[PDB]
User: Which sequence fits this backbone?
C-alpha cells in the first residue's frame, strides 16, 4: 500500500 | 557525486548437470549510478533473449540487478558475464565456473 | 522474518534518473515484503500502471490497482519536479545526468503491530533527507537538504507521514502477510554441501555451500578445532537464484591433510538446528 503524501523539496 | 563499481557474480540457478535445462544468472550489485550494461555470453556471442530483474537498491543506496536466461550447460560450452559501467575503463568479463 | 526481532517488513524503493535531452526522467518503483518483490512500476513501460510481481498480489480488486497506480504516478511527477528543485539547490547545470532515489516503509513486530518506520531520500547516491527513527525529526546532510528540513518542519509533514506509517503502511503489510502466507511465512531451509579444490599440494580451498533458502538472512562460519576462522574465510554476498530463493558460500584456505579440524556451521531460520558440515 503505497504512500499518499507528496511534498516538494 | 558518488560512483561505485559493480560486484559481479555469474552462476547457475540449480546445480549444473550436462544436458539438463537450467538458468544462468548474472548478479550485479553495489554500484552507482543505475546505468549498467550486462550481457550473458555463450562461447563469445551475446545471448539475445536475456531478461533482468527490476531496478532495486540496498540500504546504502547501491543498485542491484539480476540477469538470467534458460540454458543447458555442457562439458565443453563456456559461458560468461560481461559488465560495463562508468567506473570501468574496459568491459570486465567473468567466466562461469560450475564449482565457482 | 528478521530472526533477531521476530519482525517482517514492507519496503518501496524508488529511483528517478534525469535524461538531459532524451525526454523526461525515468521513474522505477518496486515494492517488497521482506525478501519478496510484489509490485513494480516503470514510467517508460507501455502499461502506465502498477503491475503485479508476486502471485498472491493478483488476488486484488480493481480499486486497488486504480489507486496504487494513482499514487505511484503521483510520486513520479513529484520527484521529477524535485530533480529540478535539487538541481537548483546545488547550483548545477541541466547538462549532466542525476539520480534521485526514495525509500519508505514500515516493520511489524512478532505482535503483528507497528514497530518501525522509514522515509528517506538520496541524491546522486548520497543521503539527502531522512526521517529519524523516532519519526518526529529529520536529518539533513548537506546544507542544501536543510532547506527542505525546515520547510517540512513548518508544513508539519512528519506527523502525517507517521499517520501513513502507523496506518495504511502496517495495515497493508499485515494483509499481504496473510494473503501470501504460503510464500512469506514459509521458511525454505538451505541445502548444504561442500567442495575441495587443491590450490597447491601445500594448501587447499574448502568451500561450504547453501542453496535454495528463504529468507535471505543466513549465517555461514568456519571453525578450526572449534575456533572461528573469520580471518581466512572468504564470504560472498547472498545472491538471488531466480526461483525466489537465495545462495551463499563460504570458503577457507586450509593446510593439506588437516581438513578434518575444520568445521562449517550454518545458522538459518529454516533449520530446527544449526548445521555442522565436515569434509569427511
Assistant:
Amino acid at each position: 500500500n503505497y504512500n499518499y503524501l507528496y511534498r516538494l523539496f | 557525486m558518488i560512483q561505485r563499481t559493480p560486484k559481479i557474480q555469474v552462476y547457475s540457478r540449480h546445480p549444473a548437470e550436462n544436458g539438463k535445462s537450467n538458468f544462468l544468472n548474472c548478479y550485479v550489485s553495489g554500484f552507482h549510478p543505475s546505468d549498467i550494461e550486462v550481457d550473458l555470453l555463450k562461447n563469445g556471442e551475446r545471448i539475445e533473449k536475456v531478461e533482468h530483474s527490476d531496478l532495486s537498491f540496498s540500504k546504502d543506496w547501491s543498485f542491484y540487478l539480476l540477469y538470467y536466461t534458460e540454458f543447458t550447460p555442457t562439458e565443453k560450452d563456456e559461458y560468461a558475464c560481461r559488465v560495463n559501467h562508468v567506473t570501468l575503463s574496459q568491459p570486465k568479463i567473468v567466466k562461469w565456473d560450475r564449482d565457482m | 522474518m528478521n530472526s533477531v526481532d521476530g519482525s517482517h517488513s514492507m519496503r518501496y524503493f524508488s529511483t528517478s534518473v534525469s535524461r538531459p535531452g532524451r525526454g523526461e526522467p525515468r521513474f522505477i518503483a518496486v515494492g517488497y515484503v521482506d525478501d519478496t518483490q510484489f509490485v513494480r512500476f516503470d514510467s517508460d513501460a507501455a502499461s502506465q500502471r502498477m503491475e503485479p510481481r508476486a502471485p498472491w498480489i493478483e488476488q486484488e480488486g480493481p480499486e486497488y490497482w486504480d489507486e496504487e497506480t494513482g499514487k505511484v504516478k503521483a510520486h513520479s511527477q513529484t520527484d521529477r519536479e524535485n530533480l529540478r528543485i535539487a538541481l537548483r539547490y546545488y547550483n548545477q547545470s541541466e547538462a549532466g545526468s542525476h539520480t534521485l532515489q526514495m525509500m519508505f516503509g514500515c516493520d511489524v513486530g512478532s505482535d503483528g503491530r507497528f514497530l518501525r518506520g522509514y522515509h528517506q531520500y538520496a541524491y546522486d547516491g548520497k543521503d539527502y533527507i531522512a526521517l529519524k527513527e523516532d519519526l518526529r525529526s529529520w536529518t539533513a546532510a548537506d546544507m542544501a537538504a536543510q532547506i527542505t528540513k525546515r520547510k517540512w518542519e513548518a508544513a508539519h509533514v512528519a506527523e502525517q507521514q507517521r499517520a501513513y506509517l502507523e496506518g495504511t503502511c502496517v495495515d497493508g503489510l499485515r494483509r499481504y502477510l496473510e494473503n501470501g502466507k504460503e510464500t512469506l511465512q514459509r521458511t525454505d531451509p538451505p541445502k548444504t554441501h561442500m567442495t575441495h579444490h587443491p590450490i597447491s599440494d601445500h594448501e587447499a580451498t574448502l568451500r561450504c555451500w547453501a542453496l535454495g533458502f528463504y529468507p535471505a538472512e543466513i549465517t555461514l562460519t568456519w571453525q578450526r578445532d572449534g575456533e572461528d576462522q573469520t580471518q581466512d574465510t572468504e564470504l560472498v554476498e547472498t545472491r538471488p537464484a531466480g526461483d525466489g530463493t537465495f545462495q551463499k558460500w563460504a570458503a577457507v584456505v586450509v593446510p593439506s591433510g588437516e581438513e578434518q579440524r575444520y568445521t562449517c556451521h550454518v545458522q538459518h531460520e529454516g533449520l530446527p538446528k544449526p548445521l555442522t558440515l565436515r569434509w569427511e
Chain A touches chain C at residues 1-9 (CB under 8 Å).
